[PDB]
Structure 1
């Protein structure tokens, strides 16, 4: 898998060179490239942002600079991912589906986002996905791209989860559930499913 990430903050993708992602990249499974969006600008001040049409707060990322960067990095086979608070929610099924892709391109935005015509122009030649990592507001899309790449890379390398325990059996007056010390595989699996259904009902009832 070839992964390209375009951003005004390349240093923010540095966690992808460590731990699980780092291993996958070093072992030739993944070819990861981080690019500074300013390398495609032609002006003296390397500007990437301009004032929005119709007024509004902040700045908007210019379509011609994104258009040059994507023209160079993308092909007809590329899946262009645009992290955005207005996208569809990223899920485990999306992470699983993206392991089947040959080339993923993450266009990380800052300011108030990227001019909408970049994605419309990209959609004429390649598949585009506008994706949110959740119902909260981030300063940019770099940390969302890290999250998305980590979910995809761990699937390449290889109800809510219930509680887990390890030694000691008693710690600060707190005992490991007696069932986990039974040796009985069947009642262990039954208890884990039971506490997993219970935690799901309390914390995420939408999942049952």
Structure 2
């Protein structure tokens, strides 16, 4: 897989060179390139943003700057991802599906986001997905790209064989500060253990994620 992330704060992507995704990249499973959007500006201030048509709060990222960057970085086989509050929700199934992609490009917004015409124009050439990692507002799309890449590269790196929430886990010691490991886990009975884990997962899922 090849991944490009375009941003005005390249350093925010530094966790992607660490631990699990760092290993995936070193191993040649994935090429990752992080680009400073400002390199496609041509004025003295290297400005990437300007006031919104129709008024409103804040600034909008200019289309011509983004247009040039994506012209150079993307092909017609690229999947372009734009992290935004206004996107459909990112889920495990999205992550699994994106392991089949050869080229992911992340266009990380700042301010009020990116002139909408960038995505309309990009969508003439390549597939585009506007995606939110959750129902909360971040100052930019960078740490959302970190989340999404880490989800993808986890799967890509290969996970061990083993919709409910995961149950609790325990390891040594068997008793700690007057708190005991549930005797079933010490019993060696794989049937009793599996049913116990199923029971607790079910109970958790009802309490914390009734939408599931």
TM-score range, shorter chain: over 0.9
Deviations 1:180-201 (A, max 9, x none): 0000000000000000000000
Deviations 1:23-75 (A, max 9, x none): 00000000000000000000010000000000000000000000000000000
Deviations 1:99-151 (A, max 9, x none): 00000000000010000000000000000000000000100000000000000
* Distance in 2, Cα, partners of 1:153 & 1:113: 26
Structure 1 gap segments, 5+ residues each = none
Q: Does 1:175 align with 2:180?
A: yes
Q: Does 1:164 align with 2:190?
A: no
**Deviation at 1:206?**
1.1
SS in 2 for 1:105: strand
SS in 2 for 1:100: coil
User: Normalized against structure 1, the TM-score is what?
Assistant: 0.99
* Distance in 2, Cα, partners of 1:206 & 1:37: 39
SS in 1 for 2:206: helix
Deviations 1:73-98 (A, max 9, x none): 00000000000000000000000000
SS in 1 for 2:5: strand
* Distance in 2, Cα, partners of 1:170 & 1:27: 41
**Deviation at 1:202?**
0.3
Alignment of 1:180-195 (within 5 A): 180-195=185-200
* Distance in 2, Cα, partners of 1:135 & 1:80: 21
Give the equivalent residue in structure 2 for 1:101. 101
* Distance in 1, Cα, partners of 2:115 & 2:125: 18
Q: Which runs of 4+ in 1 moved over 6 A?
A: none
User: Normalized against structure 2, the TM-score is what?
Assistant: 0.97
* Distance in 1, Cα, partners of 2:211 & 2:64: 43
